[PDB]
């Protein structure tokens, strides 16, 4: 019998994927009306992470789970396009290529840091005396869309709208909707390709198309729009959950303070406990492949829990606990394998910064609210919709 999962997973998981982590290393689940296998331990999620056998081929997918709902019936539209023809829905050798053309884009890679302080200053310089405030939409959410978009070259005056269609999207659920939302984005991203084209400057659209092989709009576009939305909504998201660990545990907190040597080892603790990404990209099967120990079918999704395999008792000490002086190297967060986060070295510099500068400005930084007040998301994205924080 597939085990069933509801709301109440989406909001708290990490209670079942200790459930279901001590019956086997991998569980067949009901997510999404769709029948999938999860994997849960640590070894076995490193392994499916390394085999061919997992396919993300989003066309085979969209398929597979409509017939689960019976509906079997194109034009694919721009904005159809753009979410599905980016690296994670593709597989090698195609995805080689594309990964290669990206990376080949600069030093831009340097001064990237002096950004991030300068915009963090001017957030923090902006939030001084407010009282009790928003940190996730005055510090966390306003960073990495200021950090982002200005690598790309999203200007000032359109990145903030940009924002709102990201967070829609986030939001939004029904197809319908999406392939809306999406069509507008990839229009504005296509104009802002074009006036690079024609104007070759100092950010990441420019050198996308000057990098033999070159990126076609279709990939030009599905890149520099996957680089805006999981550089917004993910950044922004581990920024917040690692905030209200960092407030929630008031000890350690102090302990930062003072010895800013804890800073670079906390941001894996973070990404450790709670990660805004706890869950895999889907991926379907080719072909029967063993993951765990357990035969896992042809035509079947399988996704891989990071969440379950950095709280996984054998690979790490009270799995469960927040220690900021751990050795938490080893966490599946940022992924493994072919596919790995590309800009988690961006995602750790942000919040690495973007820490330290909240602590030295403000030593009375608390939650305003009850734990109890804070509620999370319907999002597979581990959110936390409001952190009322108290500077003083
Ligand atoms: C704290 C922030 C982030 C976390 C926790 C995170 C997590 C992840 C994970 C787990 C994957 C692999 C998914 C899978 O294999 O199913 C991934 C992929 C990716 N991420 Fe991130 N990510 C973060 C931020 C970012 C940022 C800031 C960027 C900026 C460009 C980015 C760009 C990418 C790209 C390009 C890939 C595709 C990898 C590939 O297909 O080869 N991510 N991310």
């Given at each position: 019998t597939?085990?069933?999962?509801g709301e109440?997973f989406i909001?708290?998981?990490?209670?079942?994927?200790?459930?279901?982590?001590?019956?086997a290393?991998v569980?067949?689940?009901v997510?999404?009306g769709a029948?999938?296998?999860?994997?849960?331990?640590?070894?076995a999620?490193?392994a499916?992470?390394?085999?061919?056998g997992?396919?993300?081929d989003?066309?085979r997918?969209?398929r597979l789970?409509?017939?689960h709902?019976?509906v079997?019936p194109?034009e694919?539209?721009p904005?159809?396009?753009?979410?599905?023809?980016?690296?994670?829905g593709?597989?090698?050798?195609?995805?080689t290529?594309?990964?290669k053309?990206?990376?080949?884009?600069?030093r831009?890679?340097?001064a990237?840091?002096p950004?991030?302080?300068?915009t963090?200053?001017?957030?923090?310089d902006?939030?001084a005396?407010?009282?009790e405030?928003?940190?996730l939409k005055?510090?966390?959410f306003?960073?990495?869309?200021?950090?982002?978009?200005?690598m790309?070259?999203?200007?000032?005056?359109?990145?903030?709208a940009?924002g709102?269609?990201?967070?829609?999207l986030?939001v939004?659920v029904?197809?319908?909707?999406?392939?809306?939302?999406?069509?507008?984005?990839?229009?504005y991203?296509?104009?802002?390709?074009?006036?690079?084209?024609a104007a070759?400057?100092?950010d990441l659209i420019?050198?996308?198309?000057?990098?033999?092989?070159?990126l076609?709009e279709?990939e030009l576009?599905?890149?520099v729009?996957?680089?805006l939305?999981?550089g917004?909504?993910?950044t922004?998201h581990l920024?917040?959950?690692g905030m209200?660990?960092?407030?929630?545990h008031?000890?350690?907190?102090?302990?930062?303070?003072?010895?800013?040597?804890?800073?670079?080892?906390?941001?894996?603790?973070?990404s450790?406990?709670?990660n805004?990404?706890?869950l895999?990209t889907?991926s379907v099967?080719?072909?029967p492949?063993?993951?765990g120990?357990?035969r896992?079918?042809?035509?079947?999704f399988?996704?891989?829990?990071?969440?379950?395999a950095?709280?996984?008792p054998?690979?790490?000490?009270?799995?469960?606990r927040?220690?900021?002086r751990r050795?938490?190297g080893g966490h599946?967060?940022?992924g493994?394998?072919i596919?790995?986060c590309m800009?988690?070295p961006?995602?750790?510099?942000?919040t690495?910064?973007?820490?330290?500068?909240?602590?030295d400005?403000?030593?009375?930084?608390e939650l305003?609210?009850?734990?109890?007040?804070?509620?999370?998301?319907?999002?597979?994205?581990?959110?936390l919709?409001s952190?009322?924080?108290?500077?003083?």
């Open positions: 597939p085990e069933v999962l109440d909001r708290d998981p990490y209670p079942v994927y200790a459930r279901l982590r001590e019956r290393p569980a067949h689940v997510l999404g029948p999938m296998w999860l994997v849960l331990r640590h070894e999620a490193r499916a992470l390394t085999d061919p997992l396919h993300k989003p066309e997918c969209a789970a409509a017939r709902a019976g079997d194109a694919k539209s904005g159809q396009r753009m979410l599905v023809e980016h690296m994670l593709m597989d090698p050798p195609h995805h290529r594309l990964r053309l990206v990376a080949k884009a600069a831009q890679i340097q990237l840091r950004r991030i302080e300068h963090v200053g001017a957030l923090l902006g939030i005396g407010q009282g405030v928003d940190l005055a510090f966390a306003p960073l990495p869309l200021t950090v982002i978009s200005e790309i070259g999203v200007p000032q005056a359109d990145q903030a940009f709102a269609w990201s967070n829609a986030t939004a029904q197809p319908q909707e999406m392939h809306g939302i999406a069509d507008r984005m990839a229009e991203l296509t104009g802002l390709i074009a006036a690079k084209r070759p400057d100092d420019s050198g996308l198309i000057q990098a033999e092989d070159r076609s279709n576009v599905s890149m729009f996957q680089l939305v999981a917004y909504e993910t922004a920024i917040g959950n209200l660990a960092l407030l929630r008031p000890d350690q907190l102090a302990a930062l303070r003072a010895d800013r040597s804890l800073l670079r080892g906390a941001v894996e603790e973070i450790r406990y709670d805004s990404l706890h895999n889907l099967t080719s072909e492949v063993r993951i120990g357990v896992i079918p042809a035509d079947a399988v996704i891989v829990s990071l969440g379950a950095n709280h996984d054998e690979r790490f000490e009270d799995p469960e927040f220690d900021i050795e938490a599946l967060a940022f493994h394998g596919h790995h800009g988690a961006l995602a750790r510099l942000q690495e910064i973007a820490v330290g500068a909240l602590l400005r403000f030593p009375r930084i305003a609210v009850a734990p109890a007040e804070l509620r999370r998301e319907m999002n597979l994205t581990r959110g919709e952190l009322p924080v108290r500077l003083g």
